[PDB]
Scaffold this active site. Sequence first.
Site, short mmCIF file in Angstrom:
data_model
loop_
_atom_site.label_atom_id
_atom_site.label_comp_id
_atom_site.label_asym_id
_atom_site.label_seq_id
_atom_site.Cartn_x
_atom_site.Cartn_y
_atom_site.Cartn_z
N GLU A 194 26.07 5.25 -10.08
CA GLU A 194 27.07 5.91 -9.24
C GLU A 194 26.64 6.04 -7.78
O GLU A 194 27.47 6.37 -6.94
CB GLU A 194 27.39 7.29 -9.81
N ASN A 231 4.04 11.68 0.66
CA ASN A 231 4.38 11.02 -0.60
C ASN A 231 4.90 12.02 -1.63
O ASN A 231 5.69 11.65 -2.51
CB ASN A 231 3.17 10.27 -1.13
N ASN A 236 8.16 8.08 8.74
CA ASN A 236 7.03 9.01 8.74
C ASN A 236 7.15 10.07 9.83
O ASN A 236 6.70 11.21 9.64
CB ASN A 236 5.73 8.24 8.90
N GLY A 273 3.11 -6.14 5.27
CA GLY A 273 3.21 -7.56 4.97
C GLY A 273 3.84 -7.79 3.62
O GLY A 273 4.93 -8.37 3.52
N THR A 274 3.17 -7.34 2.56
CA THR A 274 3.72 -7.46 1.22
C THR A 274 4.77 -6.39 0.96
O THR A 274 5.56 -6.50 0.01
CB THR A 274 2.61 -7.38 0.18
N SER A 328 7.57 -0.48 2.17
CA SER A 328 7.69 -0.16 3.58
C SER A 328 8.10 -1.41 4.34
O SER A 328 7.50 -2.47 4.16
CB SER A 328 6.37 0.38 4.14
N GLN A 386 0.83 -1.20 0.00
CA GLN A 386 0.00 0.00 0.00
C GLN A 386 0.86 1.25 0.00
O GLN A 386 0.54 2.23 -0.69
CB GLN A 386 -0.95 0.00 1.20
N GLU A 391 -3.54 -6.70 -1.68
CA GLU A 391 -4.84 -6.16 -1.31
C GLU A 391 -5.35 -5.31 -2.47
O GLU A 391 -4.69 -4.34 -2.86
CB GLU A 391 -4.75 -5.34 -0.03
N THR A 428 2.66 2.03 13.47
CA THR A 428 1.30 1.63 13.14
C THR A 428 0.98 0.21 13.61
O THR A 428 0.03 0.02 14.37
CB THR A 428 1.07 1.72 11.63
N1 LIG Z 1 5.64 7.82 4.21
C1 LIG Z 1 4.56 7.06 3.99
N2 LIG Z 1 4.45 5.83 4.60
C2 LIG Z 1 3.36 5.05 4.38
C3 LIG Z 1 2.35 5.49 3.54
N3 LIG Z 1 1.40 4.53 3.51
C4 LIG Z 1 1.78 3.51 4.30
N4 LIG Z 1 2.99 3.82 4.85
C5 LIG Z 1 3.77 2.97 5.77
O1 LIG Z 1 3.55 1.61 5.44
C6 LIG Z 1 3.38 0.83 6.60
C7 LIG Z 1 2.42 -0.32 6.33
O2 LIG Z 1 2.76 -0.93 5.11
P1 LIG Z 1 1.79 -0.84 3.83
O3 LIG Z 1 2.57 -0.67 2.55
O4 LIG Z 1 0.88 0.35 3.99
O5 LIG Z 1 0.91 -2.19 3.86
P2 LIG Z 1 1.28 -3.49 2.97
O6 LIG Z 1 2.68 -3.42 2.40
O7 LIG Z 1 0.27 -3.64 1.87
O8 LIG Z 1 1.24 -4.75 3.97
P3 LIG Z 1 0.00 -5.77 4.04
O9 LIG Z 1 -1.30 -5.05 3.75
O10 LIG Z 1 -0.03 -6.38 5.42
O11 LIG Z 1 0.21 -6.89 3.05
C8 LIG Z 1 2.86 1.78 7.66
O12 LIG Z 1 3.44 1.49 8.91
C9 LIG Z 1 3.29 3.16 7.20
O13 LIG Z 1 4.34 3.63 8.00
C10 LIG Z 1 2.46 6.72 2.92
O14 LIG Z 1 1.56 7.11 2.18
N5 LIG Z 1 3.57 7.51 3.15
N1 LIG Z 2 36.99 22.03 -15.64
C1 LIG Z 2 35.89 21.25 -15.74
N2 LIG Z 2 35.77 20.18 -14.92
C2 LIG Z 2 34.69 19.38 -14.98
C3 LIG Z 2 33.64 19.68 -15.96
N3 LIG Z 2 32.70 18.73 -15.81
C4 LIG Z 2 33.11 17.90 -14.82
N4 LIG Z 2 34.30 18.28 -14.33
C5 LIG Z 2 35.05 17.61 -13.25
O1 LIG Z 2 35.03 16.20 -13.44
C6 LIG Z 2 34.83 15.52 -12.21
C7 LIG Z 2 33.70 14.52 -12.39
O2 LIG Z 2 34.12 13.50 -13.30
P1 LIG Z 2 33.10 12.94 -14.40
O3 LIG Z 2 33.35 13.60 -15.73
O4 LIG Z 2 31.67 13.14 -13.96
O5 LIG Z 2 33.47 11.39 -14.47
P2 LIG Z 2 32.78 10.42 -15.55
O6 LIG Z 2 31.28 10.45 -15.38
O7 LIG Z 2 33.29 9.02 -15.35
O8 LIG Z 2 33.14 10.90 -16.94
C8 LIG Z 2 34.46 16.56 -11.17
O9 LIG Z 2 35.49 16.62 -10.17
C9 LIG Z 2 34.41 17.88 -11.90
O10 LIG Z 2 35.14 18.87 -11.18
C10 LIG Z 2 33.84 20.86 -16.82
O11 LIG Z 2 32.99 21.18 -17.68
N5 LIG Z 2 34.96 21.57 -16.65
MG LIG Z 3 -2.15 -3.40 2.39
#
Ligand SMILES: Nc1nc2c(ncn2[C@@H]2O[C@H](COP(=O)(O)OP(=O)(O)OP(=O)(O)O)[C@@H](O)[C@H]2O)c(=O)[nH]1
Ligand SMILES: Nc1nc2c(ncn2[C@@H]2O[C@H](COP(=O)(O)OP(=O)(O)O)[C@@H](O)[C@H]2O)c(=O)[nH]1
Ligand SMILES: [Mg+2]
EC number: 3.6.5.-
Lengths: 435, 430, 37, 118, 429, 426, 44
Positions: free
Chosen positions: A249, A223, A201, A139-140, A135, A11, A66, A174
């Site tokens: 990365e 959310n 939460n 359960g699921t 979460s 859920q 569910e 909960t």
């Molecule tokens: N941040 C956030 N947490 C949520 C939300 N809805 C549910 N939760 C969390 O999910 C937990 C319960 O799990 P759920 O995903 O809702 O239920 P479920 O996975 O379907 O588990 P079952 O129904 O028993 O099969 C709760 O303790 C909440 O903390 C949400 O909208 N936002």
């Molecule tokens: N001088 C300069 N340095 C850069 C530029 N873009 C990225 N960098 C440097 O490159 C590093 C990141 O490496 P990156 O190119 O993302 O690695 P890659 O994804 O494997 O190619 C960072 O430390 C940046 O400071 C640029 O346009 N100019």
């Molecule tokens: Mg459920």
Amino acid sequence: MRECISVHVGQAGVQIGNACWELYCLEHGIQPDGQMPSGGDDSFNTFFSETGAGKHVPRAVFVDLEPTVIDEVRTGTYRQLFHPEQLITGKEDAANNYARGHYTIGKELIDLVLDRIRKLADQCTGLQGFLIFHSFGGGTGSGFTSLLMERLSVDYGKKSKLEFSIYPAPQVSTAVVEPYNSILTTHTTLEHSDCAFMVDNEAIYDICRRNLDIERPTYTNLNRLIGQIVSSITASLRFDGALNVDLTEFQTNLVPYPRIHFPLATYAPVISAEKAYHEQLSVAEITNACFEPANQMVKCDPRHGKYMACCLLYRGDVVPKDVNAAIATIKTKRTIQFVDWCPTGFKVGINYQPPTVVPGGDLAKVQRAVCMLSNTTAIAEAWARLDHKFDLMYAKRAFVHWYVGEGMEEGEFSEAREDMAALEKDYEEVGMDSV
Amino acid sequence: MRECISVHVGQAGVQIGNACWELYCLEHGIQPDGQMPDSFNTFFSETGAGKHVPRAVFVDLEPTVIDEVRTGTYRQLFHPEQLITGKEDAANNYARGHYTIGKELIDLVLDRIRKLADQCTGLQGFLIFHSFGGGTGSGFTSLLMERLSVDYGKKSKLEFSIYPAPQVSTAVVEPYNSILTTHTTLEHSDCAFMVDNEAIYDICRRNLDIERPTYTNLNRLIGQIVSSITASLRFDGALNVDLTEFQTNLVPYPRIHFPLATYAPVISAEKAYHEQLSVAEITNACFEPANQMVKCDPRHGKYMACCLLYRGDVVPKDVNAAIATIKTKRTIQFVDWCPTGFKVGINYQPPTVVPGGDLAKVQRAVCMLSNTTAIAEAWARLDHKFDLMYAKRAFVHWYVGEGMEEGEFSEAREDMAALEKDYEEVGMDS
Amino acid sequence: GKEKFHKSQHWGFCNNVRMLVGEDKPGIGGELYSVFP
Amino acid sequence: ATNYSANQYEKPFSPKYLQNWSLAKPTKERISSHEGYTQIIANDRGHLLPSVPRSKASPWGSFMGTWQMPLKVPPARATLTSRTAAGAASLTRWIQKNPDLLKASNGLRPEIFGKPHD
Amino acid sequence: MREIVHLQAGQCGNQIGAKFWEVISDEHGIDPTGTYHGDSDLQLERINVYYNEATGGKYVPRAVLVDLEPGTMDSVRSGPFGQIFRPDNFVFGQSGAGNNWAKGHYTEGAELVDSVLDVVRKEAESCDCLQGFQLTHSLGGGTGSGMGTLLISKIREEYPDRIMNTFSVVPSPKVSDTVVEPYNATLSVHQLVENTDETYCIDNEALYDICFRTLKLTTPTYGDLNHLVSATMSGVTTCLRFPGQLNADLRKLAVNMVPFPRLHFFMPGFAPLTSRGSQQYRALTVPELTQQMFDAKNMMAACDPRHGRYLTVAAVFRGRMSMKEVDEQMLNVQNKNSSYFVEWIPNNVKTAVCDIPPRGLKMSATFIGNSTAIQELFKRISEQFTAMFRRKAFLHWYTGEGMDEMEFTEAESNMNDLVSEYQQYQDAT
Amino acid sequence: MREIVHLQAGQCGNQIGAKFWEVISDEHGIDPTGTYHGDSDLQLERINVYYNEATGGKYVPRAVLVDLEPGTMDSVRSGPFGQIFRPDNFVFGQSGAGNNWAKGHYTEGAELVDSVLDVVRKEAESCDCLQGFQLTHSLGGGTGSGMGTLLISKIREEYPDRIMNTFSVVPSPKVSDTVVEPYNATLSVHQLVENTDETYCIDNEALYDICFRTLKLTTPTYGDLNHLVSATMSGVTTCLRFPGQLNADLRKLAVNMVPFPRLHFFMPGFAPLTSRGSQQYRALTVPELTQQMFDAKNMMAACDPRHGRYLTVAAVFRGRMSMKEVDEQMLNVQNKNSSYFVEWIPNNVKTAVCDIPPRGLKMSATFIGNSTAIQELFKRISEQFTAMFRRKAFLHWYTGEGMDEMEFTEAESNMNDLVSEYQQYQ
Amino acid sequence: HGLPFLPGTSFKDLTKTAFHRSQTLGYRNGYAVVRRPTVGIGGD
Ligand SMILES: Nc1nc2c(ncn2[C@@H]2O[C@H](COP(=O)(O)OP(=O)(O)OP(=O)(O)O)[C@@H](O)[C@H]2O)c(=O)[nH]1
Ligand SMILES: Nc1nc2c(ncn2[C@@H]2O[C@H](COP(=O)(O)OP(=O)(O)O)[C@@H](O)[C@H]2O)c(=O)[nH]1
Ligand SMILES: [Mg+2]
Ligand SMILES: Nc1nc2c(ncn2[C@@H]2O[C@H](COP(=O)(O)OP(=O)(O)OP(=O)(O)O)[C@@H](O)[C@H]2O)c(=O)[nH]1
Ligand SMILES: Nc1nc2c(ncn2[C@@H]2O[C@H](COP(=O)(O)OP(=O)(O)O)[C@@H](O)[C@H]2O)c(=O)[nH]1
Ligand SMILES: [Mg+2]
């Protein structure tokens, strides 16, 4: 290319997935009927697809046991967007059981979900990885997301598999049998997950109460904030940016050791409309809010532990010099402790495109935004408290007949806690300075 | 030129051929009176009065289902000579359809084929529709291929059979008919494309949102297969394929000639908008075990012969890239002695949708015909049901009394046991 | 054409000798006594 | 069947380039040369001749379904560095205690690339 | 006065041949009816090599169409250039081939031998001086592989001094277009290697990558693939039809291409083949043509020349060009790449330069490579033929009509002797 | 005549080289459609070194574009000069490098190294006399650091007698833009030591210090940081392209700047760069340009030359100026502070000039200096590397691709030997 | 505004909001296709 496949299970995953997929539509102009009111832009293919007739269908699969959580989507405002076969429901829920989600009722739909993911992956010219929303408490949300990843490891192997998991909050909860599910779904995910972005939460509740001027927030507000994070994660490969950051990365720059892959996600420019009029949002000023303990979206004090790795994702009209000068001041700050074996600590990423508001939401029009994904030693006391929950229920063997009586041996509990009790010393060992 | 005579036997053959000839008249412009308001001359014979008469014979030992044809819309189309009716049904008996009542009607059928063999300049092959479970579907069908083989010999002889459903069944004496009709037609048939009933029930439930199908939906889906098999004899294609091509590419051994039929673009009018139907995305759906129309997963068996028949806006390179993707999948396994596996058939003509049907107007389509090892467990289960019945002698007085020695039951069972030994001896490697 | 690719049978046999049977037949659908109402 | 290579054009038909991201079966790179007539190894109707050696495997295949798959599935990422010797032993033991999964067509191809501490 | 008779066997050779005659008629100026509407007068003197004059000013192609059914010749005449062939040249049987080399060569092809050879002679005896024969077919089907190979046998036993040229389409390495194709390939090669002087190895996989990597065709068809084949067949016969400062007909090409009578299997290629939107990114000069000929991924055989050594190479260049640039570029490629060129034949490249280019182009060239890496084609089919002969896979469709297993046996020996000869003249010093 | 093949890998390399192809097209007059729209004939005579003739007076560059993900290439191709590159020169992968040297060099880079060297072989023998190569990347990345070093080794084994260049972007001293920068830098330098003839070390911090303190630039993006890098590249290649009083190509610089075959890590700079409103306070003379040549804040490596000693120094000029003034200024800067120059070479500075300055400037120069003080760049990486290596910080993402531990110990030893040999001459 | 191409002469447009990256480099059925760019960053 740069395609990504999103799996929403439970859920929680569907309700977050409702706010994730409404935001992705507003970032691309895709209407709820799946028509773009316009070869022009092709930035949608990382999330959406084409059918020739101008129809964009999400590269997502919705699985639940569910039915009355997905049946809103089938009869809602986005009933024509999602493919019907991509929305998958069962007959009976997992009833807050990891055993039902893994062994009896989760084994039902796993072959049909794997089949649907294959048809989604066959349309992907370049696949960055898998995103899975669940979460730990459900359960699921704990059972089926555990069985899926074992099957994804068999089928897809080392393909990048990232998770957005709703942690059980340390004081607010909960369900009652929820700590049992959290230990079980952590044990069988350690070797199969690549990285697991974590949020609960209670910490969003305080941020919604304080940082935003909304009293009594709803799950819908939670959310959208999570949806803004996943959007900020992926939009480096969605949009033109100075420093491109990909999904592959994240596992390299945030998972130092194979059995610790639980960083913490936060989104610091979360301010109300009345409060945005007074303060300026500069790059140095918003990146300090990534490091305040009250602004963390996981209820744990980062001062209690030490930072292992950080992944800064900047979104908007950020200047790389002001990004650089901001990190330098944080390094000179003494109240934030980094481990000795990671002198670098920071990975920065810059995207040019400003965050676009949902029309009528809580978030203000920020010109620039930053999303921080940091792996801290301070999550160890969260496991220590979560140990205090499972164990204080396991000494009397409470609530185990629902688990041991359906497809699951009792020795599973006698091996799944010992393995994650080793994380306590794994987080201790990485938190000691070498002399 | 390139003529093809079609034969329907049993009530299954008549009702399938009713929806088949509805499609054949519709994709050639033939109005249901025979008149046209030269592609027709493979299925239709043009008469000197302008009335195009089907090149087929409707043989059935029961008059009831035939009188639907003699009364319905296609009354004037069908030739009263070319339609043969019985007097009394075989009553679910192999014996009655083969010995007692089938023997007094088969003498008129071959005369009908002989007049139909004189009007064809070049005959590509026969086309026989039946079901295993029935009396005249299993008994009279056997009398055909024994007499067609001595009449023609080297002429091609393709056949369509309704395989008994693995979990449901219309009748109890069905395993008696199915084992007895395969023992004598194992050496009298060139190839036997097979199709099930419960599998199409699953196909009509999942792929299209029409729950509760009837037999008309099944015959329409089968009719799309038979049109797609013979589409290349009538319309231009990129690489053309014949009716004679199908026997030497799908039958490795004279005992193993039971391939499986699969139609991939089985989609409703509401879902063609949701997904594209490109050649790569529909050929991957051919090998999908949920889209197959015989209930047996080929993942649990091996592939030794596969055939692909594309019709529509397809690209030969997209065909090539699709098959190479399937050849890289670990779900699909082949035998050691077939390193090729595939042949292709491409037609320029897109399929012609029937009004009042259920499939949408698709730009391209593919029909998949493959011989697999997974049908061995299907033969294994069918012989179990025969062995549970023949153990304590049951329903045999309804066979032995009606002009048929009881020892036939033995040599049919001795044959069929070797046919399963023929299926595990072909999968083993060196 | 576009929806019509009917291949007419141009060649054939009469009197057991090789031939063009049609000599006025359509192609892929298009072109290569009294009229009564 | 064996997935052959077109040598110079094997690259466009590599598995991930053909949009199949699932541990796909390898392609053969080299083939040797025979030097004359082959030998009939099996009579008509398909039975292998009595003299020739026979393989020892399931004639049907090695597809492991979703119900015959072993519980507690091992990982594919099996690096052993930054891991204690007992933990590296447990990771190695977990992968090696289910030989049925490691010989299946839809099996798990592991990668134990790493050396534990001493 | 130096004319050649064209042969079309099977449905693969029919679509290739129909596209070939469309290309020649465009190049020689012949309209879809048969008259002449060409601009330059250099399109008239050597029409005789391909066409025949008929009363009315209409030129009739000197080609015979053979198939076991008229099914694909219905589409040949329904095409744009199907009104140019004589109806008497269309020879069709009654029943189809079934991808059987048996039915094309023993049962059904045998009744059509007397009809086709009667057509072959009446074209060849109307010839003042016949130059050779030219056949298109495939090694995967029944009519192209069975009837066409038999036609080679009956032509060569009557006209031994004349040359036999064919352009055979070999089976694909990765995705088979016929389940029973390794039998029909091996049986055809066993008689192609004995009864032909020139043969061209055309593979469909190589044409696909040419259409995507170099042509950048978004949606290719068989019309484009047969056009690339037809451009190669027109290139090799250009010196017969157009004057040039260095000409070479098929025999002058065949004498110095094959060093031994059993080594006559080639690899085609087309030089100026470029895309639509990148015409302005590449200069059209002599170094660019000789690179694209000698780039590996421009072969038409799907066999990598870097896995073997080039015995002899041909270069039939078309266009007004300086001979120093041609000669110096051929020397470089032989010098820059010395490990892919044999060291017991000092020069390995034959150069012929004509003057009349293909229409719409400035410069062109045709590549014919007798690499020792075409044994990979023979190695692959031999393994397949081993795998299907060991456990008798489809033999009953073949031995059930008259062939003995010894025919399949001697096809293995001769074809595996071919790989032995290629390997011998690749490791020799 | 004297052509250079340009190759570039990685995101950082592609953005730098795209800006580099903008400065070349601006000074050679090449239009975004790729046509000559300039003014003088000393703008067309030596086009061959970078571009190639096409049909109808079109000039396609000789650049080879390498990355494992074309998201950076898609950004480059949608720019104002993204259409000059030939589509056949775009070679790209399907999955990301992951900031992993192991993926870029060993596993994922192997499937593309065949296609890159085919394009390199395409552009090598199509010119009469290839002068050499040039590579732009960053050592902190995964595909610039990993594949770029792999492409260096494959070029060197086939073309070992031609000079090859490396405009590598070394890690920043105080702030890291990637967590696993020391691992990628240690593994790439170990390749760069025995595989390069010249190597120019550039970091973002010195470019930030140049943009803030010397350009007075409020909002520096990556377009104008790569411009500083692009101006240095045009400076060293200037005598290859335009006539001058004292010409000096790439190797003539490399002969008298590399004293021993190990010491080839230089420091770049751009003298004529001025402030925002300070042009009216600036005299247009050689002495004020000369004092901005050797000035420490003008360095592009953030390694202060006061802490070390200059081994060798290069000085390529642009414009019509007298050479007594230039030679006197180079003699005064050697003689006024001789403690910053090695006493064992009488003249550490090479003077090169050209008669054609870039447009908008009356007189220009570039600075290329080989100093001892670049050893603190390698020590800083080394102390960061060994801190992550004793605890085995991120090795499981490296050894999970087949890589063994002894290469990491080997890569540390080669840098520590390079520190010691720099320390010898100080 | 006609300034020479110098590092201090780079100015961006702040009125531009959409930053959309189009994929002109991708893969069809096995080949690396390089499309002709029709739009730039942001859909313009
Ligand atoms: N941040 C956030 N947490 C949520 C939300 N809805 C549910 N939760 C969390 O999910 C937990 C319960 O799990 P759920 O995903 O809702 O239920 P479920 O996975 O379907 O588990 P079952 O129904 O028993 O099969 C709760 O303790 C909440 O903390 C949400 O909208 N936002
Ligand atoms: N001088 C300069 N340095 C850069 C530029 N873009 C990225 N960098 C440097 O490159 C590093 C990141 O490496 P990156 O190119 O993302 O690695 P890659 O994804 O494997 O190619 C960072 O430390 C940046 O400071 C640029 O346009 N100019
Ligand atoms: Mg459920
Ligand atoms: N798909 C399909 N199957 C049919 C249809 N009609 C009959 N069948 C099959 O045939 C069975 C009915 O008995 P038949 O086998 O046809 O009987 P018969 O062949 O006429 O033989 P007798 O009536 O016993 O003389 C059904 O269970 C179906 O499996 C039809 O319209 N469509
Ligand atoms: N180039 C080309 N090849 C074709 C064409 N049609 C069929 N083929 C090839 O021919 C082979 C099959 O041969 P087949 O059609 O059975 O020959 P037939 O039995 O003599 O008619 C396949 O591998 C195809 O690649 C065509 O139009 N062009
Ligand atoms: Mg009945």
